[PDB]
Amino acid sequence: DLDLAKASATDQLKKAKAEAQVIIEQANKRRSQILDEAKAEAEQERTKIVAQ
């Protein structure tokens, strides 16, 4: 049972690791979402304040 503990522990760490690795990807994408939103609302604003 020593190696039951050993193996289950190693794979359980790896699952925590992968769960982090996918917690990061959503983070990167959400950044892209909100940052491109800011880019759009910046250009669309500039290009009419200046027209005014």
Partner: protein, 52 residues
């Protein structure tokens, strides 16, 4: 965008004062053209030689 607006204001003031300068010196020439006078002209000669 605000910087760009201010830059356009500067640019337009300058390109306006250019027009007025052009017409100003052309008009001053048209003024000399008929205020010119043998007595005043000889006075110009006198003053420039006296300064020579």
């Amino acid at each position: 965008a605000q910087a760009e607006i201010e830059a356009e204001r500067k640019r337009a003031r300058e390109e306006l004062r250019k027009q007025v300068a052009i017409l100003a010196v052309a008009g001053a020439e048209k003024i000399i053209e008929r205020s010119v006078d043998e007595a005043a002209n000889s006075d110009i000669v006198d003053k420039l030689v006296a300064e020579l």
